[PDB]
Amino acid sequence: EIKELLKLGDLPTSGQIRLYDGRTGEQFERPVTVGYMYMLKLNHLVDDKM
Amino acid sequence: REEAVVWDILDEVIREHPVLLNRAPTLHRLGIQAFEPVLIEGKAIQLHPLV
Amino acid sequence: SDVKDSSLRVPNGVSGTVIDVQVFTRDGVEKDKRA
Amino acid sequence: KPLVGTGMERAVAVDSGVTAVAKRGGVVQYVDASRIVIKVNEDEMYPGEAGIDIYNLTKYTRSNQNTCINQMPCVSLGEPVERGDVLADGPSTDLGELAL
Amino acid sequence: ARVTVQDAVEKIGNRFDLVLVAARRARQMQVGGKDPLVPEENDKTTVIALREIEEGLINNQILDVRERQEQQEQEAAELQAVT
Amino acid sequence: QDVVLGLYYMTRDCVNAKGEGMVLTGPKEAERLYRSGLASLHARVKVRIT
Amino acid sequence: TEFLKPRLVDIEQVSSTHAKVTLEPLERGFGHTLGNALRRILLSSMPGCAVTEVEIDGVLHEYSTKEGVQEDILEILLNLKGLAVRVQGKDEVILTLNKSGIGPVTAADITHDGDVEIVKPQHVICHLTDENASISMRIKVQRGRGYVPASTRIHSEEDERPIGRLLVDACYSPVERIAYNVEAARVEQRTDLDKLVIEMETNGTIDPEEAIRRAATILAEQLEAFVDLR
Amino acid sequence: TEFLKPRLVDIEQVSSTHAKVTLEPLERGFGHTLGNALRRILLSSMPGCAVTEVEIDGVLHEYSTKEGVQEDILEILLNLKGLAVRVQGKDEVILTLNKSGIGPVTAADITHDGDVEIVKPQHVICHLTDENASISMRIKVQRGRGYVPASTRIHSEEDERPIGRLLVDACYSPVERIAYNVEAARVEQRTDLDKLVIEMETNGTIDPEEAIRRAATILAEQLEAFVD
RNA sequence: UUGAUUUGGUGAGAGG
């Protein structure tokens, strides 16, 4: 169902897109995984520890 | 006040002066090692990965 | 000279905006006539 | 709004009382700068005590961990709401879901 | 500049006496009166001491010889100034 | 951890790539063939090393 | 030396914001070099105007709330930080927004001057609900590049300003997305030439041929240090 | 809206074919722009001339073996590819070398015309075991740009050359290695800047700063059209 | 000669 939903959107089925590099402008070999992860900011902030 | 001239003073007191970095559960002697500082815009100690 | 500075200041390293000031002080706080 | 959730975000965001869940359903008057004002539909409305529900939004204030607990209205003016529906999104909530 | 002190450890073969010899020398340069035996690249007295050690011109024997020479110079200065 | 993955992907081989079995006059033009886009990072090759 | 020179041959506007541009003809291998260099420069270093100081009447700090509106004041400052302005003559202007009555406050309600152009007439800012409510904010639009934030601009500002002016972060760069493609050129006698199809996505305020010209001048004046001195 | 121009602070000349152009300070994320642009131009676009084809007697393809030599013809092909020649007037010069006697054959042993010269005469070609061995090769030198290898050369050619002609990789561009870093410099307030350190090693026939200046003016004349 | 109070001790929770 993840693959079938990735086929409803026009995305590649493997979940992996070829990505270029912003520094060199040239392709990363062996396509990498891009997606959306729900990332959280925990309350261990660095200018309360320094 | 941290005026514009004390940062050159700071780069002239750092230069060849090592510091002892120490991770909090030190078990053997390789858990206290001395480095030379390189100043960081930031608030986090940048630590060389192999170490 | 013998007077001192206990005046509660802002702690070292923090910034911010004073969003609220509460005062249920010793029945007398009024400075000029604000109370 | 977590794109990949489990659907238990709704129950946690309602059942923890950080959002202003509507007590009696109906429409809205929406003064809201200070309080959500909800006109009540007649079936849920008592015969005496004509009555429209005025919800207090808790704006920027201190939590126990120095974070900011803040409620924001997620309903517009003149919009139907039902009993048990949410009206004001608390901290870390997005339209009644749970957005950490 | 300085990354490793390995040649200085080679020429004073104890690795615990290197610190003492270079500390005696860097106190001779810091307070100190003395001027270094080596060109300085805006290095501090630590690295100038260890950099003198690596080229084989400061060890414990040279420092004791120089302090006997300064003691004899102070002796001759006291004798030729008074008598 | 990252650096051993970078080495294990670098010094490896595959049975066909760009520049299979060509001959190279040194490691400097090996890196020049990798950067210009004429060979692959793992492509078996006779080099002349000293 | 058998090299050539490229020109901007066809500049198509797919919309007012998203717009491609060709480059023709490029030499062999130069396509990814110029494309990546123009990408890095066109994403880092373009000048665009943005909102810097917002001055609402009767509002002290940004974490308060106001009479008659939907969005709170932090929401208003975020929706103003997204604004897209295009001044022509000056480098620092002050706009005015005054509106009363029930209904949303678009960006088209700002009482414009002559040399400022607000290119998004459907940008929403407020949702005025009370008919007795009013809002009168005075925006200040500077012009720069990069990203300069409120913390650094807390002491950097020299002109002693009065207290009550909310400081909004400055997102100055009007380029948001840029992609280049190296196709095969259709040259009638050469087969070893290529074209560069740069696909920009702007803030609506920048003109793409002007942006490409400025990025080219930035690259040439940076390389003059290599050209002249050694 | 004014940009930081740098000063070229150092040319640490290690050898006559080595340099390290320390360069500071640039805007944040500009060292990679300049370095990558110069690196791609210096790799695959810089003009120059070297050996492309060679016709040798006694051999019929690249895997035969002539007598009198310790090394084989792959080694003579590789040591020929390592030779750096410069042509001044023309662009297609054929050269011929003949060597007999006990001793190695070096680059000074070749027969040269008035337009060509060798930048490293003590660069070895081969060695000779027999005093009766008479080696002979017809060394053709074209002039192109960058790098073209013998694999796609033999894929691109179609005309039937005579048997005994040998293809070699054409190291047209005179640089051998360019690889930079980007370090971090400091102007007294902003620490976000960055300093370029371009390393370069070439063959003969050029001075590394001349190669850098050539690549820079190649890119500037390439971008000379649509500027202000 | 130009200024001041937590460590003390308990309980609860957290990080590596």
Side-chain angles (χ1 to χ4, degrees), chain E residues 3-54:
Chain E
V3 44
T4 60
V5 297
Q6 185 62 40
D7 290 330
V9 179
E10 296 294 327
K11 286 183 178 291
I12 300 174
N14 205 358
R15 178 57 167 265
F16 294 89
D17 291 329
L18 178 65
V19 173
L20 293 174
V21 172
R24 192 177 183 180
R25 176 65 190 177
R27 291 174 178 280
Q28 288 184 353
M29 289 187 291
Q30 181 181 177
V31 177
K34 298 178 178 67
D35 51 352
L37 281 78
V38 72
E40 51 185 356
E41 295 289 328
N42 291 316
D43 287 329
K44 288 187 184 294
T45 62
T46 293
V47 178
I48 296 169
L50 293 168
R51 184 179 174 183
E52 287 178 350
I53 303 299
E54 287 190 354

Short mmCIF file of all heavy atoms in Angstrom, two decimals, chain E residues 3-54:
data_model
loop_
_atom_site.label_atom_id
_atom_site.label_comp_id
_atom_site.label_asym_id
_atom_site.label_seq_id
_atom_site.Cartn_x
_atom_site.Cartn_y
_atom_site.Cartn_z
N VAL E 3 52.68 19.90 16.23
CA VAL E 3 51.66 18.87 16.33
C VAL E 3 52.08 17.75 17.28
O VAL E 3 51.35 17.40 18.21
CB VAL E 3 51.28 18.33 14.93
CG1 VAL E 3 52.50 18.07 14.05
CG2 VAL E 3 50.45 17.06 15.05
N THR E 4 53.28 17.20 17.09
CA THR E 4 53.81 16.13 17.93
C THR E 4 55.19 16.49 18.42
O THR E 4 55.94 17.20 17.75
CB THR E 4 53.93 14.81 17.20
OG1 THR E 4 54.81 14.99 16.09
CG2 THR E 4 52.59 14.34 16.69
N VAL E 5 55.55 15.94 19.58
CA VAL E 5 56.83 16.24 20.21
C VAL E 5 57.81 15.08 20.06
O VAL E 5 58.74 14.98 20.85
CB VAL E 5 56.64 16.60 21.68
CG1 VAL E 5 55.81 17.84 21.79
CG2 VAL E 5 55.95 15.47 22.40
N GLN E 6 57.65 14.26 19.02
CA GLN E 6 58.27 12.95 18.98
C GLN E 6 59.79 13.03 18.88
O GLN E 6 60.49 12.27 19.56
CB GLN E 6 57.70 12.13 17.84
CG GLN E 6 58.20 10.71 17.80
CD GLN E 6 57.81 9.95 19.06
OE1 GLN E 6 56.71 10.10 19.57
NE2 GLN E 6 58.73 9.13 19.55
N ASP E 7 60.31 13.96 18.08
CA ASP E 7 61.76 14.13 17.99
C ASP E 7 62.36 14.64 19.30
O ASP E 7 63.47 14.24 19.67
CB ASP E 7 62.11 15.09 16.85
CG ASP E 7 61.85 14.49 15.49
OD1 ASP E 7 61.97 13.25 15.37
OD2 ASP E 7 61.52 15.24 14.56
N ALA E 8 61.63 15.51 20.00
CA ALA E 8 62.07 15.97 21.31
C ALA E 8 62.10 14.84 22.32
O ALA E 8 62.95 14.82 23.21
CB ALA E 8 61.18 17.10 21.79
N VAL E 9 61.19 13.88 22.18
CA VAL E 9 61.22 12.69 23.02
C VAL E 9 62.39 11.80 22.63
O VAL E 9 62.99 11.14 23.48
CB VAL E 9 59.87 11.97 22.90
CG1 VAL E 9 59.83 10.72 23.73
CG2 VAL E 9 58.79 12.89 23.35
N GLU E 10 62.76 11.80 21.34
CA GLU E 10 63.91 11.02 20.90
C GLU E 10 65.20 11.55 21.49
O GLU E 10 66.05 10.78 21.95
CB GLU E 10 64.01 11.00 19.38
CG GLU E 10 62.86 10.31 18.65
CD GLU E 10 62.78 8.83 18.90
OE1 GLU E 10 63.83 8.18 19.09
OE2 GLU E 10 61.64 8.30 18.91
N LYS E 11 65.36 12.87 21.53
CA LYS E 11 66.63 13.44 21.98
C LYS E 11 66.75 13.59 23.49
O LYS E 11 67.86 13.80 23.99
CB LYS E 11 66.88 14.79 21.31
CG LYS E 11 67.28 14.64 19.86
CD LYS E 11 67.60 15.95 19.23
CE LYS E 11 68.04 15.74 17.80
NZ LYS E 11 69.36 15.08 17.75
N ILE E 12 65.65 13.51 24.23
CA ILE E 12 65.68 13.37 25.68
C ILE E 12 64.80 12.17 25.98
O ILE E 12 63.57 12.28 26.08
CB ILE E 12 65.19 14.63 26.42
CG1 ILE E 12 66.05 15.83 26.06
CG2 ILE E 12 65.26 14.43 27.91
CD1 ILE E 12 65.53 17.10 26.64
N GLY E 13 65.42 11.01 26.13
CA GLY E 13 64.70 9.76 25.97
C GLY E 13 63.85 9.29 27.12
O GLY E 13 63.64 8.08 27.25
N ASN E 14 63.30 10.18 27.93
CA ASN E 14 62.58 9.72 29.10
C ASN E 14 61.08 9.98 29.02
O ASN E 14 60.32 9.30 29.71
CB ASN E 14 63.17 10.38 30.36
CG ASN E 14 62.93 9.56 31.62
OD1 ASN E 14 62.29 8.52 31.59
ND2 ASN E 14 63.48 10.03 32.73
N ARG E 15 60.67 11.00 28.25
CA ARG E 15 59.29 11.44 27.97
C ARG E 15 58.61 12.09 29.19
O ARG E 15 57.63 12.82 29.06
CB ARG E 15 58.47 10.26 27.40
CG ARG E 15 57.00 10.46 27.07
CD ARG E 15 56.85 11.60 26.11
NE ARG E 15 55.53 11.67 25.51
CZ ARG E 15 55.23 11.13 24.34
NH1 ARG E 15 56.15 10.48 23.64
NH2 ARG E 15 54.01 11.22 23.85
N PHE E 16 59.22 11.93 30.36
CA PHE E 16 58.83 12.60 31.59
C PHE E 16 59.81 13.68 31.97
O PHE E 16 59.44 14.59 32.72
CB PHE E 16 58.73 11.59 32.73
CG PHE E 16 57.65 10.58 32.56
CD1 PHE E 16 57.90 9.40 31.88
CD2 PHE E 16 56.38 10.81 33.03
CE1 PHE E 16 56.91 8.48 31.70
CE2 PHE E 16 55.40 9.87 32.85
CZ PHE E 16 55.66 8.72 32.18
N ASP E 17 61.04 13.60 31.48
CA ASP E 17 62.04 14.65 31.64
C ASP E 17 61.95 15.71 30.57
O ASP E 17 62.53 16.78 30.74
CB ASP E 17 63.44 14.05 31.63
CG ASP E 17 63.73 13.22 32.84
OD1 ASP E 17 63.17 13.52 33.92
OD2 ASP E 17 64.51 12.25 32.73
N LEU E 18 61.25 15.42 29.46
CA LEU E 18 61.02 16.43 28.44
C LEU E 18 60.22 17.60 28.99
O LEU E 18 60.55 18.76 28.73
CB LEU E 18 60.30 15.83 27.25
CG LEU E 18 59.98 16.83 26.15
CD1 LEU E 18 61.25 17.36 25.55
CD2 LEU E 18 59.12 16.19 25.11
N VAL E 19 59.20 17.30 29.79
CA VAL E 19 58.38 18.33 30.40
C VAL E 19 59.20 19.18 31.35
O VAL E 19 59.11 20.41 31.32
CB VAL E 19 57.17 17.68 31.10
CG1 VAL E 19 56.41 18.71 31.86
CG2 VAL E 19 56.28 17.02 30.08
N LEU E 20 60.08 18.57 32.13
CA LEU E 20 60.87 19.32 33.09
C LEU E 20 61.94 20.19 32.42
O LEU E 20 62.13 21.34 32.81
CB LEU E 20 61.52 18.38 34.08
CG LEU E 20 60.48 17.71 34.95
CD1 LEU E 20 61.11 16.67 35.83
CD2 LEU E 20 59.79 18.77 35.78
N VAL E 21 62.62 19.66 31.40
CA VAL E 21 63.64 20.45 30.71
C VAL E 21 63.00 21.60 29.94
O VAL E 21 63.45 22.75 30.03
CB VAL E 21 64.48 19.54 29.79
CG1 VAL E 21 65.39 20.38 28.93
CG2 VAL E 21 65.29 18.60 30.62
N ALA E 22 61.92 21.32 29.22
CA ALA E 22 61.24 22.39 28.51
C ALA E 22 60.55 23.37 29.45
O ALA E 22 60.38 24.53 29.08
CB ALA E 22 60.24 21.82 27.52
N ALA E 23 60.18 22.96 30.66
CA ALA E 23 59.60 23.90 31.60
C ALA E 23 60.65 24.81 32.19
O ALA E 23 60.40 26.01 32.36
CB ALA E 23 58.87 23.15 32.71
N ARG E 24 61.83 24.27 32.49
CA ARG E 24 62.94 25.09 32.95
C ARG E 24 63.34 26.11 31.88
O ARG E 24 63.55 27.29 32.17
CB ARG E 24 64.11 24.18 33.30
CG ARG E 24 65.26 24.77 34.06
CD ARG E 24 66.22 23.63 34.34
NE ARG E 24 67.40 23.97 35.13
CZ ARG E 24 68.34 23.10 35.46
NH1 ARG E 24 68.24 21.85 35.05
NH2 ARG E 24 69.37 23.47 36.19
N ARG E 25 63.34 25.68 30.62
CA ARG E 25 63.68 26.59 29.53
C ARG E 25 62.59 27.63 29.29
O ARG E 25 62.88 28.81 29.07
CB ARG E 25 63.94 25.80 28.25
CG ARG E 25 64.19 26.69 27.08
CD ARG E 25 65.46 27.48 27.28
NE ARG E 25 65.61 28.52 26.29
CZ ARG E 25 66.62 29.38 26.30
NH1 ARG E 25 67.55 29.29 27.23
NH2 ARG E 25 66.69 30.31 25.37
N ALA E 26 61.33 27.22 29.35
CA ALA E 26 60.26 28.17 29.09
C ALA E 26 60.08 29.14 30.24
O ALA E 26 59.57 30.25 30.03
CB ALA E 26 58.98 27.42 28.78
N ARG E 27 60.52 28.79 31.44
CA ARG E 27 60.62 29.79 32.49
C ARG E 27 61.84 30.68 32.32
O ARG E 27 61.82 31.82 32.80
CB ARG E 27 60.68 29.13 33.85
CG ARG E 27 59.39 28.52 34.18
CD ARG E 27 59.45 27.75 35.43
NE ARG E 27 58.12 27.24 35.67
CZ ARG E 27 57.17 28.00 36.19
NH1 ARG E 27 57.45 29.25 36.49
NH2 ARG E 27 55.96 27.52 36.40
N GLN E 28 62.89 30.19 31.68
CA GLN E 28 63.97 31.10 31.31
C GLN E 28 63.59 32.06 30.20
O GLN E 28 64.25 33.09 30.04
CB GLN E 28 65.21 30.32 30.88
CG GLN E 28 65.94 29.65 32.00
CD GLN E 28 67.20 28.98 31.53
OE1 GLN E 28 67.47 28.92 30.33
NE2 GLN E 28 68.00 28.50 32.46
N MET E 29 62.56 31.75 29.41
CA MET E 29 62.10 32.70 28.40
C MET E 29 60.89 33.53 28.81
O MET E 29 60.64 34.56 28.18
CB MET E 29 61.74 32.00 27.08
CG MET E 29 62.91 31.48 26.30
SD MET E 29 62.37 30.86 24.70
CE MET E 29 61.45 29.43 25.22
N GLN E 30 60.12 33.10 29.81
CA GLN E 30 58.86 33.80 30.06
C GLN E 30 59.03 35.00 30.99
O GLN E 30 58.64 36.12 30.64
CB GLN E 30 57.82 32.85 30.63
CG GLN E 30 56.55 33.62 30.85
CD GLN E 30 55.45 32.81 31.43
OE1 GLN E 30 54.34 33.47 31.70
NE2 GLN E 30 55.59 31.61 31.67
N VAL E 31 59.56 34.78 32.20
CA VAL E 31 59.77 35.89 33.13
C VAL E 31 60.79 36.89 32.56
O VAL E 31 60.60 38.11 32.69
CB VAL E 31 60.14 35.37 34.54
CG1 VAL E 31 60.45 36.51 35.49
CG2 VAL E 31 59.03 34.52 35.08
N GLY E 32 61.86 36.44 31.88
CA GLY E 32 62.73 35.31 32.16
C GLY E 32 64.10 35.90 32.10
O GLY E 32 65.03 35.49 32.80
N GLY E 33 64.19 36.94 31.29
CA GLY E 33 65.46 37.54 30.93
C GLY E 33 65.97 37.07 29.59
O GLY E 33 66.34 37.89 28.74
N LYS E 34 65.98 35.76 29.36
CA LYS E 34 66.71 35.21 28.24
C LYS E 34 65.90 35.33 26.95
O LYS E 34 64.69 35.51 26.95
CB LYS E 34 67.07 33.75 28.51
CG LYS E 34 67.98 33.59 29.70
CD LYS E 34 68.27 32.14 29.96
CE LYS E 34 69.21 31.94 31.13
NZ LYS E 34 68.61 32.34 32.43
N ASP E 35 66.62 35.24 25.83
CA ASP E 35 66.11 35.25 24.47
C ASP E 35 66.36 33.90 23.81
O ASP E 35 67.36 33.24 24.12
CB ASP E 35 66.74 36.40 23.66
CG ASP E 35 68.25 36.42 23.75
OD1 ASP E 35 68.83 35.66 24.54
OD2 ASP E 35 68.87 37.22 23.00
N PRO E 36 65.48 33.44 22.91
CA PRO E 36 65.57 32.06 22.44
C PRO E 36 66.74 31.82 21.50
O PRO E 36 67.24 32.74 20.85
CB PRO E 36 64.25 31.86 21.70
CG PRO E 36 63.86 33.19 21.27
CD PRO E 36 64.30 34.12 22.35
N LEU E 37 67.16 30.56 21.44
CA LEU E 37 68.23 30.12 20.54
C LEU E 37 67.72 29.79 19.15
O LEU E 37 68.48 29.24 18.36
CB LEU E 37 68.93 28.90 21.13
CG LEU E 37 69.98 29.04 22.23
CD1 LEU E 37 69.38 29.28 23.60
CD2 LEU E 37 70.90 27.82 22.25
N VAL E 38 66.47 30.10 18.84
CA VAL E 38 65.82 29.63 17.62
C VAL E 38 64.89 30.73 17.12
O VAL E 38 64.40 31.55 17.90
CB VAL E 38 65.03 28.31 17.89
CG1 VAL E 38 63.77 28.53 18.70
CG2 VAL E 38 64.76 27.48 16.64
N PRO E 39 64.73 30.84 15.80
CA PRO E 39 63.74 31.78 15.27
C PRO E 39 62.31 31.41 15.65
O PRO E 39 61.91 30.25 15.61
CB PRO E 39 63.94 31.70 13.75
CG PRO E 39 64.75 30.47 13.52
CD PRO E 39 65.62 30.37 14.73
N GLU E 40 61.55 32.43 16.04
CA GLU E 40 60.20 32.26 16.54
C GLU E 40 59.19 32.72 15.49
O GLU E 40 59.29 33.82 14.94
CB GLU E 40 60.01 33.01 17.87
CG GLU E 40 60.46 34.46 17.87
CD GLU E 40 60.35 35.10 19.25
OE1 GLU E 40 59.87 34.42 20.18
OE2 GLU E 40 60.76 36.26 19.41
N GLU E 41 58.21 31.85 15.23
CA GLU E 41 57.18 32.06 14.22
C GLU E 41 55.87 32.49 14.86
O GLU E 41 54.81 31.97 14.52
CB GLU E 41 56.97 30.80 13.39
CG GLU E 41 58.16 30.39 12.54
CD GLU E 41 58.39 31.32 11.37
OE1 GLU E 41 57.39 31.87 10.85
OE2 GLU E 41 59.55 31.51 10.98
N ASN E 42 55.98 33.39 15.85
CA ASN E 42 54.90 33.76 16.76
C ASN E 42 54.36 32.54 17.51
O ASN E 42 53.16 32.42 17.76
CB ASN E 42 53.77 34.52 16.05
CG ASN E 42 54.20 35.90 15.62
OD1 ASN E 42 54.86 36.62 16.37
ND2 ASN E 42 53.86 36.26 14.39
N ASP E 43 55.26 31.63 17.86
CA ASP E 43 54.96 30.54 18.76
C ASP E 43 55.13 31.00 20.20
O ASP E 43 55.84 31.96 20.47
CB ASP E 43 55.87 29.34 18.49
CG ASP E 43 55.53 28.63 17.21
OD1 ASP E 43 54.34 28.62 16.83
OD2 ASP E 43 56.45 28.08 16.57
N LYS E 44 54.46 30.30 21.11
CA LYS E 44 54.62 30.64 22.52
C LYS E 44 55.85 29.95 23.09
O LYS E 44 56.51 29.15 22.43
CB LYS E 44 53.36 30.29 23.30
CG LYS E 44 52.22 31.21 23.00
CD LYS E 44 51.05 30.94 23.90
CE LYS E 44 49.91 31.83 23.50
NZ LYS E 44 50.25 33.24 23.76
N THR E 45 56.14 30.25 24.35
CA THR E 45 57.37 29.80 25.00
C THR E 45 57.43 28.30 25.18
O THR E 45 58.52 27.73 25.20
CB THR E 45 57.48 30.49 26.34
OG1 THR E 45 56.38 30.10 27.15
CG2 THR E 45 57.42 31.99 26.16
N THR E 46 56.27 27.65 25.27
CA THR E 46 56.17 26.20 25.26
C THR E 46 56.72 25.62 23.96
O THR E 46 57.61 24.76 23.97
CB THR E 46 54.71 25.83 25.46
OG1 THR E 46 54.29 26.20 26.78
CG2 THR E 46 54.46 24.37 25.22
N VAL E 47 56.20 26.09 22.82
CA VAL E 47 56.57 25.53 21.53
C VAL E 47 57.97 25.95 21.15
O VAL E 47 58.71 25.18 20.53
CB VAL E 47 55.52 25.93 20.48
CG1 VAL E 47 55.87 25.41 19.11
CG2 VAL E 47 54.18 25.40 20.90
N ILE E 48 58.41 27.13 21.57
CA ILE E 48 59.79 27.53 21.33
C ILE E 48 60.76 26.69 22.16
O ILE E 48 61.83 26.32 21.68
CB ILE E 48 59.96 29.03 21.60
CG1 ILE E 48 59.13 29.83 20.63
CG2 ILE E 48 61.39 29.47 21.43
CD1 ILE E 48 59.05 31.28 21.00
N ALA E 49 60.37 26.33 23.38
CA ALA E 49 61.20 25.44 24.19
C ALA E 49 61.33 24.07 23.54
O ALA E 49 62.44 23.60 23.29
CB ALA E 49 60.62 25.31 25.59
N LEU E 50 60.20 23.45 23.20
CA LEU E 50 60.21 22.13 22.58
C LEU E 50 60.88 22.15 21.20
O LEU E 50 61.53 21.17 20.80
CB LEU E 50 58.79 21.59 22.47
CG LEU E 50 58.07 21.27 23.76
CD1 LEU E 50 56.63 21.04 23.47
CD2 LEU E 50 58.64 20.03 24.38
N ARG E 51 60.78 23.28 20.50
CA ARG E 51 61.42 23.44 19.20
C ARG E 51 62.93 23.63 19.34
O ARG E 51 63.67 23.26 18.43
CB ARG E 51 60.77 24.63 18.51
CG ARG E 51 61.19 24.94 17.12
CD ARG E 51 60.39 26.13 16.66
NE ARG E 51 60.80 26.62 15.36
CZ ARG E 51 60.27 27.69 14.78
NH1 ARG E 51 59.32 28.37 15.41
NH2 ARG E 51 60.69 28.08 13.59
N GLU E 52 63.38 24.19 20.45
CA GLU E 52 64.81 24.16 20.76
C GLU E 52 65.27 22.75 21.10
O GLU E 52 66.42 22.40 20.82
CB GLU E 52 65.14 25.07 21.93
CG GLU E 52 65.11 26.53 21.62
CD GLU E 52 65.39 27.36 22.84
OE1 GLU E 52 65.41 26.78 23.94
OE2 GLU E 52 65.61 28.57 22.70
N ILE E 53 64.41 21.97 21.75
CA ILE E 53 64.78 20.61 22.13
C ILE E 53 64.96 19.73 20.90
O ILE E 53 65.90 18.93 20.83
CB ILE E 53 63.75 19.99 23.08
CG1 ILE E 53 63.53 20.82 24.33
CG2 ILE E 53 64.19 18.61 23.53
CD1 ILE E 53 64.71 21.01 25.17
N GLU E 54 64.07 19.88 19.90
CA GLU E 54 64.08 18.99 18.74
C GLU E 54 65.35 19.11 17.91
O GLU E 54 65.80 18.10 17.35
CB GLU E 54 62.90 19.27 17.81
CG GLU E 54 61.55 18.81 18.30
CD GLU E 54 60.51 18.92 17.21
OE1 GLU E 54 60.83 19.46 16.13
OE2 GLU E 54 59.37 18.46 17.42
#
